[PDB]
Amino acid sequence: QRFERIAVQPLTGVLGAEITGVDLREPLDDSTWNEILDAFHTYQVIYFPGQAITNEQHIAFSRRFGPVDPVPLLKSIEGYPEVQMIRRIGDDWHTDSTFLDAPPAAVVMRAIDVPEHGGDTGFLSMYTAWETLSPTMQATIEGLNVVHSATRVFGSLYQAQNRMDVDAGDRETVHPLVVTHPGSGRKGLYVNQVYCQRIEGMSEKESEPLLSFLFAHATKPEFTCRVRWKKDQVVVWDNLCTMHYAINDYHGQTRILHRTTVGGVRPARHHHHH
Amino acid sequence: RFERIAVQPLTGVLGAEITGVDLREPLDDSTWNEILDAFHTYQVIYFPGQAITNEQHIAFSRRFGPVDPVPLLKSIEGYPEVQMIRRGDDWHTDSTFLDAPPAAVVMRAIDVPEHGGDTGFLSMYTAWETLSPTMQATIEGLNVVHSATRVFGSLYQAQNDVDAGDRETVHPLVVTHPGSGRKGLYVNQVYCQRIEGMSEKESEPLLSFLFAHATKPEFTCRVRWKKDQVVVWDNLCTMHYAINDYHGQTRILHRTTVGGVRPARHH
Amino acid sequence: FERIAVQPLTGVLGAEITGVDLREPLDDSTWNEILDAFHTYQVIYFPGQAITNEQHIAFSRRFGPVDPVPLLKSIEGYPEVQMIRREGDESGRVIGDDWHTDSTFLDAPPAAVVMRAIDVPEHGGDTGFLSMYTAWETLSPTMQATIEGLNVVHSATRVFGSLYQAQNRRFSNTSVKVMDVDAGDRETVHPLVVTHPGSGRKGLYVNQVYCQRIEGMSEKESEPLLSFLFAHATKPEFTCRVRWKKDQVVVWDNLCTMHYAINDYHGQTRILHRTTVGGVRPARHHH
Amino acid sequence: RFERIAVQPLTGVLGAEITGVDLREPLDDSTWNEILDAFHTYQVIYFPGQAITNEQHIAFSRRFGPVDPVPLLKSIEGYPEVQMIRREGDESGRVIGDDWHTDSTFLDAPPAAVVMRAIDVPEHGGDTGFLSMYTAWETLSPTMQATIEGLNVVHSATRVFGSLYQAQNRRFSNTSVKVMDVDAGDRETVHPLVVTHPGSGRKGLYVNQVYCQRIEGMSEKESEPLLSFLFAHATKPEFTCRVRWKKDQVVVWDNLCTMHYAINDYHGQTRILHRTTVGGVRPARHHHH
Ligand SMILES: O=C(O)CCC(=O)C(=O)O
Ligand SMILES: O=C(O)CCC(=O)C(=O)O
Numbered sequence A: 001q002r003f004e005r006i007a008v009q010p011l012t013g014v015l016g017a018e019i020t021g022v023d024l025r026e027p028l029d030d031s032t033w034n035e036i037l038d039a040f041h042t043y044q045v046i047y048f049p050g051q052a053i054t055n056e057q058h059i060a061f062s063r064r065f066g067p068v069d070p071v072p073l074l075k076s077i078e079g080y081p082e083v084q085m086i087r088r089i090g091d092d093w094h095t096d097s098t099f100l101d102a103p104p105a106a107v108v109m110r111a112i113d114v115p116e117h118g119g120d121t122g123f124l125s126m127y128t129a130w131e132t133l134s135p136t137m138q139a140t141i142e143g144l145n146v147v148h149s150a151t152r153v154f155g156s157l158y159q160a161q162n163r164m165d166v167d168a169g170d171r172e173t174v175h176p177l178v179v180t181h182p183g184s185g186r187k188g189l190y191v192n193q194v195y196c197q198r199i200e201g202m203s204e205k206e207s208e209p210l211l212s213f214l215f216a217h218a219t220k221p222e223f224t225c226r227v228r229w230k231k232d233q234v235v236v237w238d239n240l241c242t243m244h245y246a247i248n249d250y251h252g253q254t255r256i257l258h259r260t261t262v263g264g265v266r267p268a269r270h271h272h273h274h
Numbered sequence B: 001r002f003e004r005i006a007v008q009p010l011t012g013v014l015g016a017e018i019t020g021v022d023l024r025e026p027l028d029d030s031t032w033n034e035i036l037d038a039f040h041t042y043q044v045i046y047f048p049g050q051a052i053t054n055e056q057h058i059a060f061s062r063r064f065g066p067v068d069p070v071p072l073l074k075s076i077e078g079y080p081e082v083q084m085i086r087r088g089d090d091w092h093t094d095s096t097f098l099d100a101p102p103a104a105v106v107m108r109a110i111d112v113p114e115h116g117g118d119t120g121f122l123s124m125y126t127a128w129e130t131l132s133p134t135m136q137a138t139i140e141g142l143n144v145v146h147s148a149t150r151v152f153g154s155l156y157q158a159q160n161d162v163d164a165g166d167r168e169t170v171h172p173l174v175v176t177h178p179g180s181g182r183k184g185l186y187v188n189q190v191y192c193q194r195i196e197g198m199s200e201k202e203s204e205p206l207l208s209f210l211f212a213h214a215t216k217p218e219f220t221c222r223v224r225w226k227k228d229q230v231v232v233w234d235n236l237c238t239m240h241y242a243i244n245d246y247h248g249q250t251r252i253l254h255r256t257t258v259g260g261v262r263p264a265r266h267h
Numbered sequence C: 001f002e003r004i005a006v007q008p009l010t011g012v013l014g015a016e017i018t019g020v021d022l023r024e025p026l027d028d029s030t031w032n033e034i035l036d037a038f039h040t041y042q043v044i045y046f047p048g049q050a051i052t053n054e055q056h057i058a059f060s061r062r063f064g065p066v067d068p069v070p071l072l073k074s075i076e077g078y079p080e081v082q083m084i085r086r087e088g089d090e091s092g093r094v095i096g097d098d099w100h101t102d103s104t105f106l107d108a109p110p111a112a113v114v115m116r117a118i119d120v121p122e123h124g125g126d127t128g129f130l131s132m133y134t135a136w137e138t139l140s141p142t143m144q145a146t147i148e149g150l151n152v153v154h155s156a157t158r159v160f161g162s163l164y165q166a167q168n169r170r171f172s173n174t175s176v177k178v179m180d181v182d183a184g185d186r187e188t189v190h191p192l193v194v195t196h197p198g199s200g201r202k203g204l205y206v207n208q209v210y211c212q213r214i215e216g217m218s219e220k221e222s223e224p225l226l227s228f229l230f231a232h233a234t235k236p237e238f239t240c241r242v243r244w245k246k247d248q249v250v251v252w253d254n255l256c257t258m259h260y261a262i263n264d265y266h267g268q269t270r271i272l273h274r275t276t277v278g279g280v281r282p283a284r285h286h287h
Numbered sequence D: 001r002f003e004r005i006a007v008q009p010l011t012g013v014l015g016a017e018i019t020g021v022d023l024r025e026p027l028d029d030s031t032w033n034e035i036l037d038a039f040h041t042y043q044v045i046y047f048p049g050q051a052i053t054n055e056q057h058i059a060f061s062r063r064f065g066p067v068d069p070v071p072l073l074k075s076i077e078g079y080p081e082v083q084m085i086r087r088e089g090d091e092s093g094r095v096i097g098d099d100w101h102t103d104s105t106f107l108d109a110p111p112a113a114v115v116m117r118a119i120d121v122p123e124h125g126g127d128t129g130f131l132s133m134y135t136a137w138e139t140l141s142p143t144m145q146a147t148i149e150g151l152n153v154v155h156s157a158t159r160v161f162g163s164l165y166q167a168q169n170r171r172f173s174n175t176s177v178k179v180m181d182v183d184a185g186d187r188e189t190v191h192p193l194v195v196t197h198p199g200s201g202r203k204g205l206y207v208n209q210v211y212c213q214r215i216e217g218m219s220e221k222e223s224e225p226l227l228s229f230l231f232a233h234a235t236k237p238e239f240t241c242r243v244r245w246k247k248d249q250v251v252v253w254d255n256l257c258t259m260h261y262a263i264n265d266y267h268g269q270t271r272i273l274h275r276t277t278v279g280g281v282r283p284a285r286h287h288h289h
């Protein structure tokens, strides 16, 4: 499509794009914002090189995407509670915090101090993962829901490795296996190995073959892109329709990023129509 | 509840010993109906001590459904419905690559080892019934492509009539038994290739899960063969497994096949 | 066999022993034949043996000293005799319904178990057995050479340790003692391949209930090999199936067999009494 | 380290951009030695702005070893040593190399290296994944390493152009691919599971899903779990890099210690690259007896 106010360079044939010709230190006019939002909706993960911005500017940019909440979480930046420090879940493919009834809609991350080489982030499209399934596979699983919890990350199953709050780790939520993105209207797969326990109404054993197949299917290299971080890069990813993977190939070097979270609504099959 | 025969179940899931009946003789209606009841309930049934003839084996078989005049290479001379079986070891049921596989098989031990050569059986009713309602609802409408390609078609030839080996048929994943009215799972690793409409990759995890689920020991029984034992198994709602632990000994049985109707979800 | 009658159950393992009265002391010649049959057939059963507790204990003592198993409740009056019991009304976890051999989380697991039917269903409640000699002997020479030197980490974590506590499938108070979680998590290491101290034969020694990983490997590294061995050892042709009749006594070798409890008797009482004979540390050689 | 070339590593595991060199020209000894160093270290190297001709591509290739064309691929027009990787705008058939593999491991002596040049490539799309089998090997536990180091693996082309290929329906186009012999597709060779690179002296894992059939001496059932585990382990994203192609980019990869993966995310566009293959020696555990 046509971009007049920004320059967009797609990273692959599936997802990811470099956005230039904008200064995120400044407020964005309506026309420029609308192009950024349509690039976000199309490309699903977008990155802005060369944006030496402040905390308030990071927060204000984030707010264009949706609400960002006065969080004061343990890793909140002092004086700027909407920004968290990320200093280095992780190295399995996932999307963030799917154990919540309403996970983030997006995340906006800024490199503060990063390696010259190493520390890439993989991304993939769950739209493409869904669309490459056969019509029969689609019809078979489209109505299923999946139980998500943090039990293997900070709940009882985690604790039971022998060598946050445990109740909060164990609390289950249920999301559709196939979700409709509230902004693009597109269907995407919604499952991940970090937080998904089982299909709602099935046993774990019953669920395992299907979940394992979907994990392997979604993560084929051709559904993926790889983002390199440079100092002052801003990355925004769609937390509903992508998954990501943190690459730890920079042993012994400092990696510091700041993060804001944009709030979403309950993942759903639709937002009041089909 | 059985007045004309004596029935001793082999396990809590399937299999039963039937005594108090002489298969040399014609069966009156009341006795036949009890045998058919026992067959429908226990799914694999065995009659010890039945020193019968070929025509008697054939006539007993005909009570279950049609048995076809057509000889095979292994037909007994003079008795083309009876075949000699002389000696499998994956769980299967027979000939599911056909549009209409056998409904049942009636096998008679002629000369068999004193120990060794058991046959495992399992119930696909119980395999189906131990799946959660949600798993059931999710897969009940699927159909499965069966062929003999890995037994005597192109895939077999590539690792070791080929057109007949490759010919595909489709059966429901879940079938209703035409006599009992019960639903059972219908899949096996020997002949099932993929789920109709799905790729192989899509299909394999679900098929492998169902194969592993159906073959848990508690869904199973084990039949020992004795001279003159007659065994009948339901070829739709059971699977079986040939145990080869009798290296170097003669094992001869006779078999008749009872014809069935196309496996289906409803009649 | 001159003193006993032995009827093998299959071509791989299992035999019926008759012509013996276990109410009586056994002369040397008869005992030696029973031991021969045990070593050969690996699981042996004696049909019509309406014996008392002292007699069960005395028969057990011929195999080795009595060393009770941690998890099971003792019968009233006899600490060496333990229950396997399930009630008509019970719906909780069934004791033994994955392939295993007993208590492999111990440094020195039982050598053998002698179990007697007290009150059992007319049909239902069989026990599966398999031979780990045969499991080992059907591996290719190259597979054998590849894994013969490996050891395996065993623990009870999924039965009464932290992983058990973390899940919902729960044992009944009926046959099973209250237990310590640290003792459930405690690791022991055994060889993957063991030499039976009585027969001198090599057998595979791994089971899905108690084995966590191969010593020195990660769980991920271990899983393919362990899963392959579990599937390989449990093929039906390596197996037999024992039916219980009232007063049948069964003896199994706890080192070279595995067993499987079949629960196809929902709604019926099943009671058996059991004595456990102590063994020594599993090892690759006894020289 | 580098005085004659500029080297920019792509990731912390493998891959590097090489600039400050003109591949139209012969390379002096000092410059070649640095390129070879970089190749040995980074395992896949790429040279962005190299509008070279066929003779120059061939002459650069010869610095790595002699030219030994790969069985499957079609030669270009005036040059039998230069082969096409090509997919047309229109094409819907099997894509060349869309499983992780290294090339032609069914040969007793597979290629040591490949040098590939972009002729006409999409503006976005058609990346190639690479990974390091040194790093795959080195992240296995010492005990796992000791357990499998002595195994050998049977390779053949049966699923690419032998009987198993003929028995299935997913078909290559006539476009980049020669008509092939089924017996040659089925012919087995055996390589060690762990190989020593003859130039770097480093051990790397040597297994791939395209050509490996079983472990020598084992049944298929015995072999499958180990091979599947190694395939999954070697292809973790952190062992990988992703190379984007620009027109006139020259890429050289080590065919012994890397694997690669062709990404097909450019449905409806032409992609043409030209390739020369450098011959290598029998993979082996040691080059010192
Ligand atoms: O460090 C990164 O690139 C992203 C890490 C991650 O998994 C997250 O914060 O969601
Ligand atoms: O042991 C048996 O009689 C069953 C033989 C068999 O498996 C077959 O009918 O294909």
Ligand SMILES: O=C(O)CCC(=O)C(=O)O
Pocket: C084, C095, C096, C097, C102, C125, C126, C127, C259, C260, C261, C262
């Ligand atoms: O109940 C049975 O059949 C055997 C249970 C068991 O595993 C045991 O007693 O060790």
Ligand SMILES: O=C(O)CCC(=O)C(=O)O
Pocket: D085, D096, D097, D098, D103, D126, D127, D128, D260, D261, D262, D263
């Ligand atoms: O097309 C590509 O990206 C590489 C394909 C491949 O495997 C090859 O050229 O050997």
Ligand SMILES: [Co+2]
Pocket: A089, A090, A094, A095, A096, A244
């Ligand atoms: Co994350």
Ligand SMILES: [Co+2]
Pocket: B088, B092, B093, B094, B240
């Ligand atoms: Co059969």
Ligand SMILES: [Co+2]
Pocket: C096, C100, C101, C102, C259
């Ligand atoms: Co037990």
Ligand SMILES: [Co+2]
Pocket: D097, D101, D102, D103, D260
């Ligand atoms: Co290739």
